[PDB]
Structures are given as C-alpha cells and as structure tokens.
Amino acid sequence: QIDRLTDQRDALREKLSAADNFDIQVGSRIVHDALVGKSVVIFRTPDAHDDDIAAVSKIVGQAGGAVTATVSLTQEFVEANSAEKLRSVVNSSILPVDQGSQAGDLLGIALLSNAAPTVEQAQRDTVLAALRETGFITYQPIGTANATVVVTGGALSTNQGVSVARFAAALAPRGSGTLLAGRDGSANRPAAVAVTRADADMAAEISTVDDIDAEPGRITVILALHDLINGGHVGHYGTGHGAMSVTVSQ
Amino acid sequence: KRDLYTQIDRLTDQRDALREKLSAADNFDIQVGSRIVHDALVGKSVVIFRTPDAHDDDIAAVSKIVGQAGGAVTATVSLTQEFVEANSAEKLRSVVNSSKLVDQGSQAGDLLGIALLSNADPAAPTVEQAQRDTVLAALRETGFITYQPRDRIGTANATVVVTGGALSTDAGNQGVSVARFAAALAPRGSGTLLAGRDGSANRPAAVAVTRADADMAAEISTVDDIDAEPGRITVILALHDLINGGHVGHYGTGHGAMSVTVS
C-alpha cells in the first residue's frame, strides 16, 4: 500500500507542476481587462499565506487593476474578545454590535468608495492609526479602493470564522464588490468561507473562492471580482463544499 | 504498526489532494479555453489530418478550440493503416503520376498539401475544386486516405497532423512516415503542427522523430500532450505563432519540449 501510494503521489506531483506551469503562463491572457481602471484593497487574517496574497496581488495587476493596500487583521481582531474596545477607540458612527460587522462597516467607509460623502485623507489616516495603535490592524503601505478581497487560511480547528465572514459581509455595501478567499479546507466549518456559503444572505452578498492555495483559485479571485464589479454577480468557486464550479462559467 | 497506518493515511491524504488539484486544473482549463485562444485564428482555415491511433476526443477538442479562436476547420482527413505502414511507395508513385522513388510520407504530404492547402505565395496557381476532388478520390481509391466531409472540401491556410501516444520500437516506420508527411505539408501552406498524446515525445513516435531531426524541428511545430487540455489549447496558440509570426516551437511535458506552452 505504502509503495503504491508513494508512486501515485510522486507521479501526481510531477503532473501538477506541469498543470500549474501552464496556468501561470497563460494567466495574463485569462484575466486580460478584467480589472482595468479598478482599485482593490486586500485584508488578510493571521492564518493567511504570503504567497497566496502575492499571487492574487500580481494577477490584479495583470488584469489592469491596482492594489491600494494590504491590511492585516490581528489575532486580537479575529478573536472577538474586544467588541467594546473597538467602539471605545474608533467606530463607524464618527465618519460621514458584533466586532466583525462594526469593523467591516468602519473599514469599508474608510477604505472603499461607495457605489454618499467622500472620506477625506485625514479621516482615513485617523481611523487607520487608531486601529493600529489599539492592536486591531497593521498595514502596508492609502487611497480609496473600488473593491476588496478578504484572504484567509484553510481549515480552522475550532468565533474567528464567524467574525471574518461578518466582517466581509459588512464591507460589501461600502464598495463595488467584496470577495472572501480561503485555502483548501476553508469550505469546511468553522472557517469563514464555510460560514458564508451556509448563510443564504451572506452567500447572496459576497463571492467566495475556497482554493486560493492553487493557481485556478488565485485566477478565479480576479474573474469573480470582475463579475461582482461589472455585473453585480455573486459566485462561489473552488473544489470544496458549496462550490458551484471550479471557476466562473462566463 | 501504528506508524505504518499513519504513513498510509498521510500518503492517501497527499495523493487525494493532488488528484483533486489536477482534476480542478483540467476543469479550469476547459472553462477558460475560449479566453486564452480569443482571436488567435481569426479569418484562418485549418485542415486536420489524423493517424489510426489518434483519438476522436482529442481531435474534437482541437476543432472546437479552433472555432473559439475565430478560425474554421475545412476537413478531417484520416491516414489509413496502409498509409502509416509506409510500405506502398511504388503504388503511391503510380497514383502521383496520374494526378527517383520518393518516400511515401513525403510524396503524400506534397500531393495533399497542394490539394488542401493554399500556398503562402499569391502567384502560386489556385487549385480548382475538380483537381482537389480527383486527387482525394485517387488516394481514397488506393487505400491511403478517407475524409470528412465527402463533398466540397475547401482550401485551408494551415494544418494540424494529430497522432496517438507512444509507439512500440518495431513501429519506427509509422513514426517516420508521419513526420515526413508533416514536413512535406509545411511549404504548401502557412503553417504545419504535429500533435501527439503523452508518450509521443519518445522514440520512435512522429513527434520524437521530428524533435531529433534538425531540419524537421526547424520547419514544423509540435505538441506532445494533446490528451490534456494544456496541449489542446497549445495547438491553437502555436498554430497562431506559425501563421502570424513564422515561429516554430516544441511544447508539452516530454523530451525536447522547450516549455509546456508558448511564451
């Protein structure tokens, strides 16, 4: 059994490298004009992978778009042991109840352009500085964006999934499209992609990709984000539970 | 005992996840194929030749991708077992003389190229329908080819010769005659590509024969993995590079491939 499983695995690893090579090489052709003139802000959870975010950022650029910022959500933010703390330092009511919704509404007004009063640079910088000072976020490097991708890791062991799904759902009405993307395993509870797909309201509001660890998933983030911005069309993609198909049907 | 069971579980988990990633890449490739080949063969016509070991699904995927690229397929011509066995050169010569003993593949490639391809040069004579039909019927009557459709096959700009995968060592005659056939078609149109299934990059298969010969490798493009979606799409992209850029390339995952697809 061990011999057959290792020979099968070794041959599959070789075959997958050729498949990944093809998809990386033709990626720019697949995403051509998908995000022309559009800006995207990326949010990442603590379990998100650098390589997944770098591949998504690169494909946004190949699609004619631009990334305004990468904002990291800290362990303190996702662990929801500070809803009262968040409101005490900065809340969405100061700009022109659960932690996820409140932070999504606040960061959405601050970083996304409503499809509403324009948020000036100083108000945005004050909001970002307050959240960083209190341990909620870190960020690189900030202008306003049209759309957003919230990137997570894969499976969660054990309400971190809920707070991130509610965070993404609260960002959605503040811009032209929100996509929640996770790695393989994110389509299983209690991860955020699974929470989103199991709730009729959230699944009709934001798109999801469950396999951002693979090249088809990284490309699909851009294609599905294009469908959100241009067509107002939501979709759930990948290889896990609740995925309607590996990628956009059109 | 527990370590052996843990090894089996971990190996099963790795193999299962790789199978899922590979099936997803094939499905992803099918869904985005039209985007990749968008406008690649606009206003161009392609004639397909197939050997007995070629697969219907590989040819249907190529024909479909040609159409998604804005092109059209004029005809599918089957080369028979008598053709690939390349032991009827004298008999073929007696047919070529009613349309030096030249090798069967080369003679047939030159004749079918004149009949089915439009020469890249405007001053070359146009082959009228009756001359084309007479040539096709003489080769069908003597057991060299069959073709679809039977009536009104038009002229094409480019060609794809489709084969199966690996050949046995004793089938060297079949690899050689098909590589020579494809090489002889090349000067008669705007581009010829020889595409085979996984294993075709190993000798004595036609793709392998082409890649190991300096002259043929410089004259026609090759794809060695037409059984996979990357290979089917690459046929159209590499055909585009031949017709529009005069650039030859050797693609796929086997010996002599410069890369999986065009750059």
Residue numbers in the entry:
A (entry chain A): 47 to 142, 152 to 170, 174 to 199, 203 to 219, 223 to 314
B (entry chain C): 41 to 139, 150 to 313
What do the authors report?
Although Mtb SteB was previously proposed to act as a mycobacterial outer membrane copper transporter, the crystal structures of the homodimeric protein, alone and in complex with the RipA coiled-coil (CC) domain, rule out this hypothesis. Instead, the high-affinity SteB-RipA interaction, together with computational and biophysical data, strongly supports the role of SteB as a direct RipA activator that releases enzyme autoinhibition upon complex formation.
D,L-endopeptidase RipA is the major PG hydrolase required for daughter cell separation in Mycobacterium tuberculosis ( Mtb ), as RipA defects severely hinder cell division and increase antibiotic vulnerability. Despite extensive studies, the mechanisms governing Mtb RipA regulation remain controversial and poorly understood. Here, we report an integrative structural and functional analysis of the SteAB system, a regulatory complex that has been shown to modulate cell separation in the model organism Corynebacterium glutamicum ( Cglu ) and is conserved across Mycobacteriales .
